[PDB]
Amino acid sequence: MREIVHIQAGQCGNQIGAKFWEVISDEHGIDPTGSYHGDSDLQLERINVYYNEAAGNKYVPRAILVDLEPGTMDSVRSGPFGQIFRPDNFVFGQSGAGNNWAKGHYTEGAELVDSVLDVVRKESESCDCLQGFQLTHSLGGGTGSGMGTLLISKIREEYPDRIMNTFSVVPSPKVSDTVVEPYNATLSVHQLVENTDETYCIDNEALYDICFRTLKLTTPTYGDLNHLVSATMSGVTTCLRFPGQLNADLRKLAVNMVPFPRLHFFMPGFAPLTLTVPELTQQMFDAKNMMAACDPRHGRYLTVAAVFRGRMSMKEVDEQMLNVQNKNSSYFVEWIPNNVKTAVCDIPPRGLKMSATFIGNSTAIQELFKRISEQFTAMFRRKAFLHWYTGEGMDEMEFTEAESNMNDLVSEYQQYQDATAD
Amino acid sequence: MRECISIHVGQAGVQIGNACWELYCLEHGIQPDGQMPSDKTIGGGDDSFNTFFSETGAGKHVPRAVFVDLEPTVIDEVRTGTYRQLFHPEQLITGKEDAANNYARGHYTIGKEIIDLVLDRIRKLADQCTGLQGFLVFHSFGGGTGSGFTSLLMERLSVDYGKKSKLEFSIYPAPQVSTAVVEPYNSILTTHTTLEHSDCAFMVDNEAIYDICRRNLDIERPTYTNLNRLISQIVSSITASLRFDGALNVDLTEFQTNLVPYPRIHFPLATYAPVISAEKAYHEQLSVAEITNACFEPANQMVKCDPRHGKYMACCLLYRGDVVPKDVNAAIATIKTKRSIQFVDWCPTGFKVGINYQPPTVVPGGDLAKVQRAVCMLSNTTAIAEAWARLDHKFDLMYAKRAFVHWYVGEGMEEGEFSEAREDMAALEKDYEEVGVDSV
Amino acid sequence: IQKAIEENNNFIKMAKEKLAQKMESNKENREAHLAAMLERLQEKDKHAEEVRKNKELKEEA
Ligand SMILES: Nc1nc2c(ncn2[C@@H]2O[C@H](COP(=O)(O)OP(=O)(O)OP(=O)(O)O)[C@@H](O)[C@H]2O)c(=O)[nH]1
Ligand SMILES: Nc1nc2c(ncn2[C@@H]2O[C@H](COP(=O)(O)OP(=O)(O)OP(=O)(O)O)[C@@H](O)[C@H]2O)c(=O)[nH]1
Ligand SMILES: [Ca+2]
Ligand SMILES: [Ca+2]
Numbered sequence: 001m002r003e004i005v006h007i008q009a010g011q012c013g014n015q016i017g018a019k020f021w022e023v024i025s026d027e028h029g030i031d032p033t034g035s036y037h038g039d040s041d042l043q044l045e046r047i048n049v050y051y052n053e054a055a056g057n058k059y060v061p062r063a064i065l066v067d068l069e070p071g072t073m074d075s076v077r078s079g080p081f082g083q084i085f086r087p088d089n090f091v092f093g094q095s096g097a098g099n100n101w102a103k104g105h106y107t108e109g110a111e112l113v114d115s116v117l118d119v120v121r122k123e124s125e126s127c128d129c130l131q132g133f134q135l136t137h138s139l140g141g142g143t144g145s146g147m148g149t150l151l152i153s154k155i156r157e158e159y160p161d162r163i164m165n166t167f168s169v170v171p172s173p174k175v176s177d178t179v180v181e182p183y184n185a186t187l188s189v190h191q192l193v194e195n196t197d198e199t200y201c202i203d204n205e206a207l208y209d210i211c212f213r214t215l216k217l218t219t220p221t222y223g224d225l226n227h228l229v230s231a232t233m234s235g236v237t238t239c240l241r242f243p244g245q246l247n248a249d250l251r252k253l254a255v256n257m258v259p260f261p262r263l264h265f266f267m268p269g270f271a272p273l274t275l276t277v278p279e280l281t282q283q284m285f286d287a288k289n290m291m292a293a294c295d296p297r298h299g300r301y302l303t304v305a306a307v308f309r310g311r312m313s314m315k316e317v318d319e320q321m322l323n324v325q326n327k328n329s330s331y332f333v334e335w336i337p338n339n340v341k342t343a344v345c346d347i348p349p350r351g352l353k354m355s356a357t358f359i360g361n362s363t364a365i366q367e368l369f370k371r372i373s374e375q376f377t378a379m380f381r382r383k384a385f386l387h388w389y390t391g392e393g394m395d396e397m398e399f400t401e402a403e404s405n406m407n408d409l410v411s412e413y414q415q416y417q418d419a420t421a422d
Numbered sequence: 423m424r425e426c427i428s429i430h431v432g433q434a435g436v437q438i439g440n441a442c443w444e445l446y447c448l449e450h451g452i453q454p455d456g457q458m459p460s461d462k463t464i465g466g467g468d469d470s471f472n473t474f475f476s477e478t479g480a481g482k483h484v485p486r487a488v489f490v491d492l493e494p495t496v497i498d499e500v501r502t503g504t505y506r507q508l509f510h511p512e513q514l515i516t517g518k519e520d521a522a523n524n525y526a527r528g529h530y531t532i533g534k535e536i537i538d539l540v541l542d543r544i545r546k547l548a549d550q551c552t553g554l555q556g557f558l559v560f561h562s563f564g565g566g567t568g569s570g571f572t573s574l575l576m577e578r579l580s581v582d583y584g585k586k587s588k589l590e591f592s593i594y595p596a597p598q599v600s601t602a603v604v605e606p607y608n609s610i611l612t613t614h615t616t617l618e619h620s621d622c623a624f625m626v627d628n629e630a631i632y633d634i635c636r637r638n639l640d641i642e643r644p645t646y647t648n649l650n651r652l653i654s655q656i657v658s659s660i661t662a663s664l665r666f667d668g669a670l671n672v673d674l675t676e677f678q679t680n681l682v683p684y685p686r687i688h689f690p691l692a693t694y695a696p697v698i699s700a701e702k703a704y705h706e707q708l709s710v711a712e713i714t715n716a717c718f719e720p721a722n723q724m725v726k727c728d729p730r731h732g733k734y735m736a737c738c739l740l741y742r743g744d745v746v747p748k749d750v751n752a753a754i755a756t757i758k759t760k761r762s763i764q765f766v767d768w769c770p771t772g773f774k775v776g777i778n779y780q781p782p783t784v785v786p787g788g789d790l791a792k793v794q795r796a797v798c799m800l801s802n803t804t805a806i807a808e809a810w811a812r813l814d815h816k817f818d819l820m821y822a823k824r825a826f827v828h829w830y831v832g833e834g835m836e837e838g839e840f841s842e843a844r845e846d847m848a849a850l851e852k853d854y855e856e857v858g859v860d861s862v
Numbered sequence: 863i864q865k866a867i868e869e870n871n872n873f874i875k876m877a878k879e880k881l882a883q884k885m886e887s888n889k890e891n892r893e894a895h896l897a898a899m900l901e902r903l904q905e906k907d908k909h910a911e912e913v914r915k916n917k918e919l920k921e922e923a
């Protein structure tokens with residue numbers, strides 16, 4: 001049908017990528033061997049969006065596993081469902097990247113990219129009608145950030161009319177001490193603003209703050225952060241994976257969510273973080289449930305997608321979504337009428353009777369980009385550690401240009417925040 | 423002859439087509455396999471129902487219809503569902519990638535790939551007509567296919583069939599069931615582009631229908647299935663004069679003469695009664711006077727607007743069932759003394775009436791009560807321009823910032839097409855203003 | 863009747879021509895937007911070559 005090709009690059013990208021496939025393989029009734037053993041035909045109606053149907057009625061993720069570090073391949077095959085991925089779709093370097101974006105983007109990553117593209121093409125050309133690509137990756141490391149953005153540009157050269165979607169994990173000192181991560185993040189954002197159609201901003205700052213302050217986890221593990229991530233990705237792909245009316249493919253979602261091409265950086269949210277419809281709704285709009293470290297009441301919503309899952313009254317959902325917009329009128333731009341769209345899927349995620357997933361295109365996202373910019377400039381202020389990058393051939397202004405493009409992004413988010421209808 | 427060909431475009435057009443054709447089959451006693459035991463002329467005939475159904479030598483009564491959508495999942499459900507035997511597979515046309523709620527893609531990028539095939543299949547239906555009267559085009563304003571592909575199709579049909587008549591059933595967007603933020607853009611683009619190519623268009627406001635299902639039928643949250651069943655009844659009332667005959671029957675074309683005083687003023691307002699649940703229809707027979715008075719209650723209109731604050735240019739009443747002129751005339755005389763019915767000064771005020779004696783039908787397991795008599799009013803009121811005003815306003819809010827315009831430019835369109843479409847709408851709104859000013 | 867024929871024909875003609883002009887300018891416009899995007903991506907590929915080359919030469923030290 002409308003096939004999505006999934007790419008996971010680097011440690012973070014591969015690691016949240018496996019959790020994503022574990023979660024949705026369970027929802028769609030597919031076990032580690034690729035066999036279906038589910039209870040509802042509704043699980044299979046759109047299975048082909050993410051899976052290939054191989055003979056023997058075996059279902060195979062349409063996924064491509066990438067890293068300059070060869071160790072992460074093994075850990076992927078080691079984890080639950082490692083048997084399900086296509087062995088040919090493992091594309092490994094050997095030398096790693098060492099948190100050096102330039103190495104991922106220009107040197108060691110560029111040596112390996114062609115071998116990844118060969119796998120991309122193979123998957124793509126077998127699609128009845130490809131809709132596009134989704135990339136999971138971090139922006140603070142070196143492969144996922146640098147090679148991931150390189151792969152985006154090379155895939156776009158050759159599917160320029162397909163949708164490019166990313167799940168980008170933003171760095172936070174609360175989770176990682178690597179000091180160059182603001183350089184790597186800022187270099188990546190300079191690419192994502194130009195070459196992706198829609199990016200979920202999975203912010204480690206926010207995942208940490210959720211685990212510590214709400215879930216009361218004193219020392220959050222990458223498994224604690226990734227439990228929130230897996231729930232979010234399951235949520236924001238519900239409309240792609242089940243029979244549905246709204247935002248049912250990547251292009252229609254982009255058309256509903258992106259009023260200006262550069263402003264495609266989304267604030268995901270989830271509820272409950274661990275129940276009645278008024279409480280779900282209120283929580284999913286709360287700053288505490290956002291996966292990006294931003295206060296929506298510090299900016300305004302251009303567009304919003306809300307997805308509810310479970311057995312519930314569509315009457316009540318409609319009343320509550322109307323209620324929250326009317327009571328929070330000031331935080332929705334008046335010059336985009338009816339900018340909040342709601343979906344209701346009958347199948348809840350596992351372990352829950354009811355859940356809500358939030359996708360916000362809010363001008364408050366500038367708070368995230370400003371935080372990265374503060375960390376970037378403190379080190380660029382004193383040209384710290386640049387030799388790691390000029391060593392791979394980079395010029396000192398590419399840093400200047402990426403800094404400048406990102407600050408332009410922030411100021412454009414401010415412009416539409418300040419716009420009025422009359 | 424005087425055949426009519428129906429074209430169902432996009433999701434809303436197709437699913438409303440499902441509902442109309444199921445309902446027509448029940449009104450005429452056609453079975454899901456297309457067999458009609460009451461038809462004694464095998465393989466052909468000049469009966470009234472042959473305006474909408476052709477006949478095969480094996481006795482199958484086949485809709486004079488084409489279904490077209492730029493993705494296959496909605497028409498796939500027609501191909502595998504209860505009435506799949508009713509349609510030859512060539513009548514059901516699908517691509518693989520839809521218009522993504524983008525007029526540009528429906529009219530240009532994707533639609534141009536399938537338009538010649540669609541026209542070829544329409545041609546094959548036309549070639550088996552002995553006196554084709556025109557086309558009935560069903561589509562949403564809001565979808566990328568319903569807006570863009572319909573507009574492209576209507577342009578091409580003007581070329582291939584001259585000024586042969588083209589009527590629309592157009593689904594006007596409502597936020598309660600809306601699927602895209604850019605529906606105001608698609609609505610204005612397609613309205614501008616088809617305005618020269620349509621002789622008469624019946625707008626169906628989904629919010630009007632949504633409210634009717636909620637207030638009058640105690641449907642807590644209506645679905646497309648609830649809305650479409652009610653829509654198909656209004657459609658059935660409008661086309662009944664074409665599919666049935668009778669002494670008091672009045673042809674739709676003859677109402678059209680009265681409804682369209684200038685080519686651009688061709689958007690009649692439909693009001694339908696009674697919409698009542700079985701629960702409340704029991705022991706309550708609704709008289710001719712009652713269903714007629716209900717026609718001037720704005721809550722029963724297919725488009726939200728207030729005719730009490732506009733002027734009438736025509737009033738048509740289409741009755742079906744147990745109705746005779748005496749009772750109609752008494753009801754009308756009462757209404758004229760009670761209601762806010764002011765005609766422009768350049769028009770006569772007499773109401774035009776048709777009666778088809780075949781009473782209304784309902785689909786089993788439906789929400790509507792089966793009743794003995796029903797009525798659809800077609801009025802030409804300046805008040806319908808309020809629907810344009812609401813939609814033009816939403817367009818203006820977004821277009822002042824060029825919100826989402828890049829999705830259209832990226833598919834080849836220019837800002838000039840947006841401004842030109844909008845200026846046509848502004849002229850349409852003044853047209854409706856000017857026709858209501860008294861003569862000098 | 864000749865005037866009726868002429869106006870129906872003129873209407874058919876101008877409709878055929880208007881659509882042809884619009885389909886053509888949409889094809890040109892869409893192609894130019896795609897071509898511009900690909901040219902920009904291609905300019906990225908040279909810049910990447912120039913960075914790898916710049917590293918060839920710091921290794922000549
Ligand atoms: N949320 C989340 N973040 C992670 C995870 N693993 C690594 N990160 C973050 O990713 C950033 C570093 O990027 P990595 O993905 O680990 O490194 P890489 O992409 O493989 O690039 P190289 O290590 O240089 O080869 C750090 O800021 C970490 O906080 C994970 O499993 N979950
Ligand atoms: N009354 C009614 N309205 C519908 C129905 N389906 C969709 N709509 C309305 O139609 C609009 C969306 O356009 P669609 O017709 O669904 O889209 P499309 O025609 O298939 O064109 P694409 O964008 O390519 O999918 C919305 O405003 C909906 O409210 C239906 O079955 N009945
Ligand atoms: Ca709020
Ligand atoms: Ca016959």
Ligand SMILES: [Mg+2]
Pocket residue numbers: 010011069097141143
């Ligand atoms: Mg690593």
Ligand SMILES: [Mg+2]
Pocket residue numbers: 432433491493520521565567
């Ligand atoms: Mg559609």
